[PDB]
Structure formats: C-alpha cells, structure tokens
Write a protein that binds this ligand. Sequence first.
Ligand SMILES: *[C@@H]1O[C@H](CO)[C@@H](O[C@@H]2O[C@H](CO)[C@@H](O)[C@H](O)[C@H]2NC(C)=O)[C@H](O)[C@H]1NC(C)=O
Ligand SMILES: *[C@@H]1O[C@H](CO)[C@@H](O)[C@H](O)[C@H]1NC(C)=O
Ligand SMILES: *[C@@H]1O[C@H](CO)[C@@H](O)[C@H](O)[C@H]1NC(C)=O
Ligand SMILES: *[C@@H]1O[C@H](CO)[C@@H](O)[C@H](O)[C@H]1NC(C)=O
Lengths: 421, 219, 218, 214, 215
Amino acid sequence: CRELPAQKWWHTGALYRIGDLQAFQGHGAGNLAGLKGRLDYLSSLKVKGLVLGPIHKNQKDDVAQTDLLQIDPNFGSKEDFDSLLQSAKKKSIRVILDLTPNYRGENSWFSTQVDTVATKVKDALEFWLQAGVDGFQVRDIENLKDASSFLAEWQNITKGFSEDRLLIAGTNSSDLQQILSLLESNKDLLLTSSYLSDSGSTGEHTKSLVTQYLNATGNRWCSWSLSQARLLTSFLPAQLLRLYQLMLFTLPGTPVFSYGDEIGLDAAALPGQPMEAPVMLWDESSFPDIPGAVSANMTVKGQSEDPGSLLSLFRRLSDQRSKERSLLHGDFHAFSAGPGLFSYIRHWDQNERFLVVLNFGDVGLSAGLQASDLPASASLPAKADLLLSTQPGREEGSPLELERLKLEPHEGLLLRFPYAA
Amino acid sequence: DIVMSQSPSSLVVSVGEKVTMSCXXXXXXXXXXXXXXXXXWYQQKPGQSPKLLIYXXXXXXXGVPDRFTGSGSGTDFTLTISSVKAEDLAVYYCXXXXXXXXXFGGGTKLEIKRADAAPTVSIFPPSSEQLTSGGASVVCFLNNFYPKDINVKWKIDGSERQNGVLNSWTDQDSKDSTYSMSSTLTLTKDEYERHNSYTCEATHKTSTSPIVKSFNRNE
Amino acid sequence: DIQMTQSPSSLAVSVGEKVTMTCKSSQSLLYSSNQKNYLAWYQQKPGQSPKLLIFWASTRESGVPDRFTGSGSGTDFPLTISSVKAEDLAVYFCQQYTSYPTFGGGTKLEIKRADAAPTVSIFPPSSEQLTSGGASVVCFLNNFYPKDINVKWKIDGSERQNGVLNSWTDQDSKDSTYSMSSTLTLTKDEYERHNSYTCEATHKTSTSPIVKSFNRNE
Amino acid sequence: QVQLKESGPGLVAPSQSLSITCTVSGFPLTXXXXXWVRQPPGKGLEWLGXXXXXXXXXXXXXXXXRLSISKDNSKSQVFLKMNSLQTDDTARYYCARXXXXXXXXXXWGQGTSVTVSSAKTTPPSVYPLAPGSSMVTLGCLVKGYFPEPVTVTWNSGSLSSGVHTFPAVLQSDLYTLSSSVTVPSSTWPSETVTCNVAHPASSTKVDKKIVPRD
Amino acid sequence: QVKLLESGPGLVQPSQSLSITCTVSGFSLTTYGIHWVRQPPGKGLEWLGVIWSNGRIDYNAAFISRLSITKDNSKSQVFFKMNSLQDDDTAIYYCARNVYDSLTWFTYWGQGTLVTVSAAKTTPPSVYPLAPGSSMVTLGCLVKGYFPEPVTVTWNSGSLSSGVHTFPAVLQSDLYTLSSSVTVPSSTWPSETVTCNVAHPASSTKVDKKIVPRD
Ligand SMILES: *[C@@H]1O[C@H](CO)[C@@H](O[C@@H]2O[C@H](CO)[C@@H](O)[C@H](O)[C@H]2NC(C)=O)[C@H](O)[C@H]1NC(C)=O
Ligand SMILES: *[C@@H]1O[C@H](CO)[C@@H](O)[C@H](O)[C@H]1NC(C)=O
Ligand SMILES: *[C@@H]1O[C@H](CO)[C@@H](O)[C@H](O)[C@H]1NC(C)=O
Ligand SMILES: *[C@@H]1O[C@H](CO)[C@@H](O)[C@H](O)[C@H]1NC(C)=O
C-alpha cells in the first residue's frame, strides 16, 4: 500500500519561544540554571522543543565587543548551560538558540558592514553544534542585506554535522511573492512571518489566507505562527483565543507559539510591562508591583484546576497533536462550506480521521457542509463522535449528524470519525 | 427557533413622557462565553425602510440623537426613550441577533398625545375632464384633526346617501400629530346630472356642529 | 476600580492634641502573598504641591517627624497624630497602589487657637488709578483668629452695601491668624461727590466697631 | 456613504420567476454581506437569506425550497430569483446590508413591492381638482391604475411642506388616491401649480396644471 | 538632584489643544516612570496616564484615547498632549515621579501649572501703589485687571516674607484682582525704599514698583 515518509523530530509536536528568560520564571532568578524546575512544567504541554532567548554577550550597537561564542554573564555561565541541555533530554525537549547579534539596538543585524556579521555567525554555528545544542533561529533577515545568499551556508553547515538539526528564519513582510521567494530553493528550513497577522477585523480573510498559502506552497512542510517574536494576544481579541490554537494545531505545519500564550497572557491591561516581554504568572507571587491587575484566573495556578480554561484546553489539544497519526503528517483537504466559517479534514488511510469546523462569525450559524469534492477514500460519514469543543455546553463524545449541526457563536469543533469504508 | 414576542401593541404618549416598551425572548440571548447580550431595535417611519438603532442591547448606532437609551438583560428587554419628539411616530421591532434563522419581532404602534383640533373641510366638484368621460366623483377632504374616531355622512339633494362611500384615512401627521381623511362618492354620468345639490357632512369629536360644506350642480 | 472614602470632611483641633484621619475603601488592601497592604498618605501645604508622608500603610519617609504614624489593616485604617504643631496645617490625602486606577480624596485640617483682635488699615486710592477714571478705596483687616468677621463700608455715615468685593485668606502657618481685603468699587464722579468714607469691623472678640475712615478733603 | 438603489416595484403573472435587483454604491460590495427580508404590509417582518463575498448562501429553513439567492460581483448588484409565485407573495422585500459576519442590518435599501395577479398593466387616469366659491387647499385625483407604486410630486418638488398624499384604496381591480396640499390664496391664480403623476411601472409621467373654474 | 520644572501655556480656548513639557533636571528618565496628575482647585486629585521607563504608555479608564503622552529622552523632555478641552477641565496640571516600579509618588513639581480654559483674552495687569495717608504701620499694594491667576507679587524681591500677607484673586468683570499686605516697621518705611514687585508669567511682564511714602 503505502510506505511511511520519514519522521524528523520537529514535525511531531510543538515549539515554544522565550524572549526574556528573566521575565519568564519571575524576577531575581534570571539564571539559565533556574529554569529546571520549570522544565517539568513545559513537559506538561509536551512541546517537542523550544527556542531559548539570545544569551550571547552583546554590548548594545558595539561591533568589536559582540561575541556569539560566550554567555552574557547576566544569565549564568557556560557550564550552567550544559547542565540545562543534559537535564532537558530527561524530558525529550530540544533546545534552540537565537543567533541575531544585535538584539538591544533597533536594527538587529548591524546594517553597516554586513559581511563581517555573517562571518561572525558563520563560525558561531560550528561551536554550538560541537556544544551539543540542536537548532538555531534568526529574526529580521529582511534587515540583513541579500539574505537568501547567506541563508544557504547557514543551512548547509547545520545540515553538515547532522541532519536532525533545525534552522528557523524570520521576517515581517506578509506578501506572498516575497515569502516563497525564500522557500523557492531553500526548502529544508522552517520560516515564520507576519503573514497571518493582518486579520480583516475578526477573521474575514482567514479562510482564504490559510488556503492560498497551503496551495501555493506545493504541499511542503511549513510552520504556522502569527509573528516571529510577539505573543498571540497582541493582534487578536480575547474572544478568538480559543479558536486559533484549534486552528494552529490541526493545520499541516509546525506550531510556533511564544511563552505565556498557553495562559493567553495579555500584554495590554498590565502596566509597567513592555510590549515584547511580560512576566509569566506562576501564582499570585509573580507580580507584586501591583496586586490588582493580576486576577486569579489569569495565572497558571488558576487554570490548572478548572477544566474549562484555556490552559486545560491546551493540555488536551497539544496532546492530540503529538499522539494521533493523521494530525502528525497527514493530508489536508478543505472542502467548501457555509458563508462565514472555515472547515477541513485530515486523513491517513486506515488511521483515525479528524473533522474540523470553525466559526469566525458572531452569530449562531448552522453548519452547512457542502463538500461533494473529496475522494471516496476520505469523505463524510453520517455521524462523528465529537472529540473536542472549545466552548462548554455539549457532550464531547456523542455522535452527531453533520447537516444538522448548529454551531454556537465563536465555537470551533473537533470531530473524530473512523474509516468505515 | 427563538420566539420573539412584543408586549405593547400600541402606545399613546404625550410630548415628553418617557416611552418604555418591552420584548420577550424564548431562551436567553445572553451567551455566557462573551457575557454580552444579543438583541436589536429597529425603527420604521411610515413610507420608509426600517433603520438601525441598537445593536448588542446597549450600544447606539452612528448618527443617532441620544434620546434612545434601551436596556434590559436576560429573557426580557426594554427600549426606553427619555422624551419623544415630533418625529418619533414609527414601528419598533425587536430582533434576535445570535441565531441562524434570525426571527424579528411582532411590531408596535407609537402615536403621540396632542390637543384637539378641528378640520378644514373642502368639497370639490368633479371636473369637466371626468365629465368628458361620462364619469363623476365628488371629493371631500378632511385635514388636520387630532381625534381619530370620526364620522363622515353624505346626502344627495338633502336626501341622505349612505352607499357609494369610499373612505381613506391616512397615518398620523409628522408635525402637528393629526390625522386626515378623504371621502370619494363615485357616480355615473346622468345619476350625477339627475340631481343638483350634494352634501358632505363632517361629524367630529371636537364640536357638536357638523362642519358641512356643500354645493349644487347649478351653483 | 477602588474608591477611597475618607471619613472627616474637616477637623478642628488645638495644638498639642491628637487627631485621627481615617479612610475607607471597597476592597481588602492586603495582598495576601505578602503581608503588606498597599497605601499612601500625602500632605499638601497651601500654595505648594504635596510631598510624601507614609508608604506601605505604616512607615515614615526619611525626613518627616514622628508625630504622624499610620495603622490599620485590611479595608479600614487611620492616620494618627501624636501631637499637632502649628506648621502642620494642611490637606491630607489617601492614595492607592493596588488596582491600577488609583486615587482618593482630600480632607482638611484646621486648628483651634486663642482669639485675636484684628488690625485695621485703610488705604485711599492713588494718583495713578484715579487718572485712569476708576475709583476703588480698599481696607485691610489683618491678624485675627475667629474666622467670621464682617467688614462694613459707609459713605458719609450712611451704610453702603453695593460695589464691595470681599476676600479672606487661609490660616497662617506661623501665628494661625487670618487676613481679609474688602475692595470698594465706584466711579471717580461718585468718589468726589462725598467726603467721608468709612471702614468698620464687626467682630466677635468685642462688640465695639473698630472704625477707620478719612475725609476726602484730607 | 451607504446608498442602496433598487428596481422599485414590479409586476409578473403568478406561478413565475423574476429577478429582483439591488444596485449598490458608495462602498466595495466584497467588504460586507447583503441580506434580504420579507414584509407584507400590516404583518410582521421575516428574514429569508444572506449572500456573501464568495457567492455563498445560508438560506432560512422556512422559505428554503422557494428562494434562489445569487450575485453579480462585477456590476455591484445582488440579485434574487423567486419561484412558484403564489397568492401571498405580494409583500415587500428590502435589500439590507450589514457588517461582515455580525448580522447588524444597518443600511437598508429603499425596498420593493411585488405583485402577482394576471390583470393588465394600465396607465392611470388623472383629474385635477379646482375649488368652489386666506389658506385654501387643492387636490389632484388619480383613478384607474394597477401598477401599484405612485409618487406624485407638485411642480417637481417646488411645493413640499403641506402635502399629504392619501393612501391608495382598491375597488374593481383598480386603485385610486387623492392628493392634498394647502396653499395660500395669493399663489394659485398667480403662480405655477402642476400636479405631476409619476408612474414608474408604467414608465409614464403626466403633468396637469389646474386652470380656474367657470 | 530630583528637580522638576515644566512649561505650560497657561490658558487655551474651549475645544483646543495643549502642550506641557516637563523638563526633568538632574536625573535620567530610563529607570523611573513619570505620571501626570491633575487637580481642579479646591477639589480632589484625579489620575492621568503614566509613561514607564520602556515606552509603555497608559491612560485612565475614564478616557482611553483622549490623551496622548509621549516621552523623548533627547533633551529629558516629557511631552503632554490633551485634545478637546473644556471649561470643566480647568485644573492644576503637574509632573510627577514614582518610586522605582510601583506607584509611591516620590515627588512632584512643587509649583505645578494652573491651566484654565476660557474664551476671554489674557490682559496685562495694572499695578497700584498703596501708602497710608493720615510703632508698626501696615502697607499694601494693588495689582488689577488680569485674567490668568498665576500673578505673584513680592516685596523687595523676597527680602521680607514673615510679616507679609498675599490675598487670593476674585473674578469680576472678566478680571481677577488681588492685593498683598505687609506689616512694616516704622523704623523702615520713609527711610528704607519699599519695592512692590509684580510678576505675571502668562503676560510675561516683570515690572517693579518702588512704593513711595505718601505726602
Ligand atoms: C517590516 O520590515 C521592514 C524591513 O526592515 C521595515 O521597514 C524598514 O524599517 C527600518 C527601521 O529602521 C527603516 O530603516 C527602513 O528604511 C525601512 N524600510 C526598508 C525597505 O527597509 C518595516 O518597518 C517593518 N514593518 C513592520 C510592520 O514590522
Ligand atoms: C553546500 O551545499 C552544497 C549542496 O549540497 C554542497 O555541494 C557543498 O559541498 C556544501 N558546502 C560544503 C562546505 O560542504
Ligand atoms: C493554486 O491556486 C492557483 C490560483 O489560485 C491555481 O491556478 C492553481 O491551480 C492552484 N494549485 C493547485 C494545485 O490546484
Ligand atoms: C478572569 O476572570 C475575570 C472575572 O473574575 C474576567 O473579568 C477576566 O476577563 C478573566 N480573564 C480572562 C483572560 O478572560
């Protein structure tokens, strides 16, 4: 029948992005060695890796003292870091590093004398690969001049020492003729952009924005993220925050979050915190500058006990992302549907099939599934047994007929139906 | 589906008397996931399309005079106007907003209380253009009176004519809050011309005296 | 959003004694992971913008004498002054940290004092002003404690009421007195139409009107 | 601005199908969702469907088997095709816009009526009204017509204040109505007073100025 | 040290714009936040928005985007821009500072700026000398005919401050007018030259008046 395409380590789950480590685990303990009690927590969401913030020593805007080969001593020391990498494989969670030299100036790439900067990061690839870490990340490559010609050898060396590494690039330009002009010959790298950033006032362009991208890409493997370094909630309403992790997980790509968005952390309505890096609220002792803006349910220790949270969803949607086979590497078919929603399917011949129906409206629309276009190897049955619903009030386990479905307003769905063919 | 019922059917309200009406829904329209309410009020003056006033039960649309402050939550809502103006006679529907088959409300009739004014009766003879055709119809307007309940009566040469009566009320007026009425008695060519005097009588609530304008064929 | 209901609108206490300024609010101010409650107090001297007194509901800022200390827990808390001085006459504030919309209102301190007979001084208008066609004879009433006083203007022995604006001051930091100006306004023509213009004091400390007047020929 | 033009009212024989047009302007149509509603006069209001920017319809279940919503994206007009026109389809249809996926019908059209009976389209017969023997009133009688909408406007909108057009009443397959306007006595022998009978579904416009009596 | 001074226009008309620049003298902005707090006189304080050290800007819940406060570390200036003013917002607007991260207001500018909103014109005042006619002898000094309240009057440029009193101004005929009195020793008055010194910043008129003893 079918011989399985090979599985690498990062199709099999989720990433995680941390910008400011001192902001992640709370104040004071801004050490690399501090985030080792937290790695038991990150294996609750079961992400299959994380990218760690830029810890190389870097005087702001200074060329001669900006060295990618040693840790900025605010964060700890180099021998602290090998205790981090060794302890992380106790939970099978990879580590990736930033390699943008400037990250305290505005332009993050030192636009004057470009080639010496790339020459600096070219040597920096070899030392960290011999240091045992696996994967890098560059941001704002459009600030770098001629970024495609330099993207080759950085891909080449991280494929050189092994082929189980990773090389993530980033950009901001959301035009498709710039985006796939990077992926045209450079195919074995992930990329994150601001392509899905510009929502058309609560998601009017989204059902086109997934499909046009997923068609023009030639069905490679890509990566799904709102932006390269910012949170989820700095673009969206807080009412759509349960209808994107449903979409960002079951799409065919690599889910790239940031930190704190498994709470749905709000950078707004928190004063004194910057736009790039709020603090993550482990319990009530995470923000003592003001006791007022921190509620009870905006914390981990508020949502870890309620099953109808956002985190309790996120502990049962990433779990379905890494486990079931069709959501891993399956095939994606988005059939036509009603006026103001978006829906698709994922199939893998004899495995389970997962039916997704979303609701980007604001009303109580009834779901008109008007498919008629699928192959008969994967087409609609009568009933589906309703795996997951983003809003409480239904069964999550009952078989429901499809053409009398009656979605609630702003509710997406996860429907699981067997082969039966 | 959601049942949209409307409690007051008609309203007499004086100028500045704080209009308040209500509408009842079948289930709740307060979805406890966004914790907002979904209902909407529509206003239609006679001869126009309806117009949007309130969305999501508490907001005002762009370009509205702010006398309209609707309220309420749960299975019952209230449209509350602070004080009426000269142009507020309309029909006021309620709407489901969060459903599939968006069922509107029933309707209500807002009319304004006003002082009692008397008509200005005018009766006109049939023109020679109609009498060219062999047709005839006498026309008797009744303009700018507040009491709706009215009595028109007709007489031919003094002898009372009860048949042949066509009535035409109008809506309440937009300025003086009055009604109006015409009366057309259509007859043939010679049945017109076999009789001389024609009598249109206006029997009103504002006075005991019938304001009777009348004319004769030879006049 | 918290609101800070301070209890006294004003308070009148002679020197050396003890007062209580309290404030009431809606919510529990004690952030329970700590044991502190988030709070402040401010002292607005008149004419000046205020300064700190107390942070964290019981401390002192550096350089403030220890007559004032704050107590209280949870939602209701006083200030207390262990002894009141003469310079401590001000307006006292309750202001907030906990939720981010922060403020409260301000109470007033006044002080009891020995009474003082006023000092009256009259002033005839100038060669500069009457050249410009306006006539305004003014009177000064300095240095009295009991606040309600009535100035009386009189023209040629007759009681005149119209054309007079009055203005008090605040209670002074040093001697805790008051001072008041009464400004007659008239025309130069009505000014020269008389001789006698009279400034009279209706005061509490005695019943005699302490009179000041002058005749215009002088 | 939001401006929504229509065809006005039209007439077809019963058990038929027809195109009810809604030409819109002042905004790009793809940025919103146009919907249609149904009102017979003296009754409630009923919603039937909504198209969208991708020519996708989500119709109502009650009027489901007897509607057909479509669209012409190019000419900025949303059509509608009724079918099997029975008796009580004589009602009003408004082409009402709303915010995209919100269902807040803010901008309505002028609305259109539809009539289904096999009687003929006929031009109206007009009769001016001259008074008998200050403030006086004048009239303009129109009888014998059955295309339904008529707007009559005096002197092409020159006189506008005291006009009360009376409603149309049906008798013997023909409607008729009465005009009314109160004009001061110094104007009528001296100025222009011309009743103008505009009839859209007969495509006829007739003007009649009132000559004094004898 | 911690020293503030700010630059306000004093008075602008109803429904107009405003620009207050707080030039922090002595300490760098990038570790301490800067608030703004307004005060209509004789009434309570009401919050306005902060600028933190990063560039994160807040406002009040009562008005989210009526206000626009921009910080610029170029010349240590903190810009303030409020739009659509009314006569119900005549107040004292002043700079402020927090304790490092929380909301203990460590200082303020001790002067502040008293801004009032009206359609009347600012007019330069008129100073009038007052020496008595017919021990301790009290003198005074009138200034008259000015719309904005900021006018201050000192005696020999702040030489005597203890025995002096200054009266508030009262609005009449669209004109505020105050006086200031001083207990004067009789050893000084016809011998030491008394100098009434009037200062109105909104008129920008600094004129000095030597008080002549009377005839
Ligand atoms: C998206 O990225 C572009 C490319 O860097 C940004 O545009 C540049 O911004 C820098 C900022 O210093 C300027 O010096 C350049 O002149 C800009 N133009 C170009 C062509 O490089 C742009 O600001 C970014 N936009 C967003 C929304 O992130
Ligand atoms: C870079 O990649 C190309 C393509 O496979 C390869 O031919 C070349 O040898 C690589 N560079 C090095 C230094 O190996
Ligand atoms: C992708 O879209 C383009 C235009 O939208 C279309 O021409 C092309 O056929 C699509 N790709 C596939 C594989 O159908
Ligand atoms: C947490 O609950 C409060 C109600 O106590 C609510 O106001 C707030 O919006 C909730 N947090 C989020 C992120 O929705």
